[PDB]
Amino acid sequence: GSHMVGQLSRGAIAAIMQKGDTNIKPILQVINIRPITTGNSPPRYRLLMSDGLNTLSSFMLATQLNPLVEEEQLSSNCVCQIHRFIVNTLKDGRRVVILMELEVLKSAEAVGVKIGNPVPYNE
Ligand SMILES: Cc1cccc(NC(=O)c2sc(=S)n3c2[nH]c(=O)c2sccc23)c1C
Ligand SMILES: Cc1cccc(NC(=O)c2sc(=S)n3c2[nH]c(=O)c2sccc23)c1C
């Protein structure tokens, strides 16, 4: 209940990005989900996620998790626990976090709002 930001793994985004910590199972909130253009391939979803302290816009859902989005279990405001993820670095140096396994801990309807006031993580 109270102190809502205590529901989220504050500091997890920086740990994933600064340290590359991959054994953690962080609890994050979905801020927004959007499709990205893929031409002739199954849809891909990019997620803006929050750990309570920071937001990060470069999470990518593994396509095997697409049905969570299409059947609306995974939507803006929901709180989820990431169980398996990998970090990948692009040619230009940017990094993306691919979500492989996750569990929705609380529905968008049960949470209802963006938790706290996280700020964009830079790099
Ligand atoms: C839309 C879009 C736009 C630009 C690039 C890419 N793709 C990737 O950067 C890479 S690199 C790499 S190893 N994989 C992917 N993508 C994959 O899906 C799978 S599955 C098993 C491996 C990989 C995409 C998907
Ligand atoms: C849009 C977009 C843009 C840029 C990059 C990428 N993809 C990746 O960097 C990588 S690297 C890697 S190992 N995988 C992915 N993506 C995957 O989906 C899956 S599933 C099993 C492995 C992987 C994408 C998807």
UniProtKB/Swiss-Prot annotation:
Subcellular location: Nucleus; Nucleus, PML body
Recorded consequence of changing R44E: Loss of HELB-binding
Domain of life: Eukaryota
Post-translational modification: DNA damage-induced 'Lys-63'-linked polyubiquitination by PRPF19 mediates ATRIP recruitment to the RPA complex at sites of DNA damage and activation of ATR. Ubiquitinated by RFWD3 at stalled replication forks in response to DNA damage: ubiquitination by RFWD3 does not lead to degradation by the proteasome and promotes removal of the RPA complex from stalled replication forks, promoting homologous recombination. Sumoylation promotes recruitment of RAD51 to the DNA damage foci to initiate DNA repair through homologous recombination. Desumoylated by SENP6.
Covalent cross-link Glycyl lysine isopeptide (Lys-Gly) (interchain with G-Cter in ubiquitin), where: K25, K91
Modified residues (N-acetylmethionine): M4
Family to which this protein belongs: Belongs to the replication factor A protein 1 family.
Associated clinical condition: Pulmonary fibrosis, and/or bone marrow failure syndrome, telomere-related, 6: An autosomal dominant disease associated with shortened telomeres. Pulmonary fibrosis is the most common manifestation. Other manifestations include aplastic anemia due to bone marrow failure, hepatic fibrosis, and increased cancer risk, particularly myelodysplastic syndrome and acute myeloid leukemia. Phenotype, age at onset, and severity are determined by telomere length.
Subunit organization: Component of the canonical replication protein A complex (RPA), a heterotrimer composed of RPA1, RPA2 and RPA3. Also a component of the aRPA, the alternative replication protein A complex, a trimeric complex similar to the replication protein A complex/RPA but where RPA1 and RPA3 are associated with RPA4 instead of RPA2. The DNA-binding activity may reside exclusively on the RPA1 subunit. Interacts with PRPF19; the PRP19-CDC5L complex is recruited to the sites of DNA repair where it ubiquitinates the replication protein A complex (RPA). Interacts with RIPK1.
Described purpose of this protein according to its UniProt entry: As part of the heterotrimeric replication protein A complex (RPA/RP-A), binds and stabilizes single-stranded DNA intermediates that form during DNA replication or upon DNA stress. It prevents their reannealing and in parallel, recruits and activates different proteins and complexes involved in DNA metabolism. Thereby, it plays an essential role both in DNA replication and the cellular response to DNA damage. In the cellular response to DNA damage, the RPA complex controls DNA repair and DNA damage checkpoint activation.
Name assigned to this protein: Replication protein A 70 kDa DNA-binding subunit
The species this protein was found in: Homo sapiens (Human)
Gene this protein is translated from: RPA1
Part of the whole protein covered: 1 to 120 of 616
